[PDB]
């Protein structure tokens, strides 16, 4: 057929040469092959099927339908870790996304500073180190609508650097006082 003993041993393991030989001597040359359009059987990519690829072929020694090991041949005995992790880089981050980190989670002033730098170019270092935060009023505000009483969280906050700069901001949220004061702090920093 295409290649008989053409260095085929160097490219395929000896265990398969018998199968290739049998195929050469059973499928005739000039066979009028035709691609199938009703059903799909081969992968969209091209593979010689001579190596068991992790995460794309069943892990040996682990139970799975279409397995050929007996109940006394399984070689998996630990289940505290994810069998068959992801290939390549081992991660599936979309384009333009970052792994979550601390990100100043310990202080929402860091988030406020980053947002205000993004929006208007003020100094995150200054906002995070030289500004003092102080709520003044934190109360529940209600609206009566068709469905019923919709309660809202209202906060007002003063932010000041103790050296002349001062501002106040009001923030209204629907879910939590924390988001209310976050919005208020944002507005105050804007309105210094």
């Amino acid at each position: 057929q295409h290649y008989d003993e053409s260095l085929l041993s160097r490219y395929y393991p000896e265990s398969l040469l018998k199968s290739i030989k049998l195929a050469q001597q059973t499928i005739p040359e000039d066979t009028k092959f035709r691609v199938s359009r009703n059903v799909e059987f081969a992968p969209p990519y091209l593979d010689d099927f001579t190596k068991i690829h992790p995460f794309w072929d069943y892990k040996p020694g682990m139970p799975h339908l279409h397995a050929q090991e007996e109940n006394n041949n399984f070689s998996i005995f630990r289940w505290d870790q994810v069998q068959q992790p992801l290939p390549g880089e081992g991660n599936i981050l979309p384009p333009g996304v970052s792994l979550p980190n601390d990100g100043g989670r310990k202080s929402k002033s860091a988030d406020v500073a980053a947002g205000l730098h993004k929006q208007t170019g003020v100094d995150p270092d200054y906002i995070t180190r030289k500004l003092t935060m102080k709520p003044l009023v934190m109360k529940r505000v209600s609206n009566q609508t068709g469905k019923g009483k919709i309660a809202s969280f209202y906060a007002l906050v003063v932010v000041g650097d103790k050296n002349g700069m001062v501002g106040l901001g009001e923030g209204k949220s629907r879910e939590e006082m924390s988001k209310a004061i976050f919005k208020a702090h944002w507005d105050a920093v804007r309105n210094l």
Binding site: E40, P44, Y45, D47, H64, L65, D80, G88, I92, G96
Partner: protein
Amino acid sequence: LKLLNMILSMMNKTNNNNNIIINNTLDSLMNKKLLLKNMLLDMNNKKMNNMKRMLNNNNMNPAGANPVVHRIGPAGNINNKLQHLNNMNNWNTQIYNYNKNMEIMNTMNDKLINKLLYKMMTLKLNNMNINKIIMSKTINQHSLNKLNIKFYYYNNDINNNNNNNNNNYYMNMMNKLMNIMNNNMNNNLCNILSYYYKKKVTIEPIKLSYIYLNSDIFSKYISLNDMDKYNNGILTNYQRMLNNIMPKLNDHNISMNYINNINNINNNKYNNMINLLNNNNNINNNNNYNNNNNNYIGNINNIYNNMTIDNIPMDILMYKYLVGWSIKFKGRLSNNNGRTSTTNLLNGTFNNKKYLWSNINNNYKLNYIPSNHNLYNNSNINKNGKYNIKVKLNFI
């Protein structure tokens, strides 16, 4: 038979072209300077027709080609294993037997063994360590020779990552369970199930690290292990974590790049086939393709160029990111007011915009669940009554 005389016939036709009784027509080189070129023109037009037949009747590509594209070929296929969930996965029990009574028997057995598997997960260590191993539903696979029970499990708390390798010298309360499932020689649960199914049985505990990668595990965990955080009211910290489990992904951009990648895949396969259609075929003379029924271009390595297992498989897979989730707590989760309460936490989106701009078409599981949605309800009992945790997740 042979053109040696058809040439003379056509020369006579040229004479007629000038006049039916004239010697010859206007001849720059005795009708050879451009008549031969026109003959070659018609021959190459015949080649064009045969060639586009050649390419068309040998086309097979994954679906996802944006119609706006120009180089996209006429062929398309959505049934690629990586781009749609096989409908056999819709049903928890995957069987067909010509004996309907046996079929009913087997579905009964599947349900009962599933409930047993649920009951067999909880564990004790020292009377103040209660470990619950949340497990999804069981996927029963009934081949003609062997039965397989496959499920996804999430341990309540894996051993601390900061902890040293000390885990290598003892087997956890969960490792013991998973080992007695199918590793013990004459004692494994598969041996017992073989009596009920008169078949060879297998079990697969696929591990999951996060609870929100599956709708069953997520709802089960909320309804069984997080009661104290919402019994008298949903804790704000719990709500914050539950709402920020996943970042705000740009579904539009994700879908657009997926479609563009499929476009590139198809176009580069098309280019491979075209270069085999033109650059090759030199030594091998024409008419050996026998385009009537044979369509073999050449070496499969050349038809599939720069398409290995390292780049193609992963970028075409679907249902990969969680871009939306909704949680509903309903029932008497409040000592005060003694009434029903519903709390809904909705984040993200619930539409796959991949199907909106490409040729890939959605398929409804059980004819009512969109392919991209996975949802589950779990009911439990507290001192006030029954309450339900309903979770819906959208994967893009």
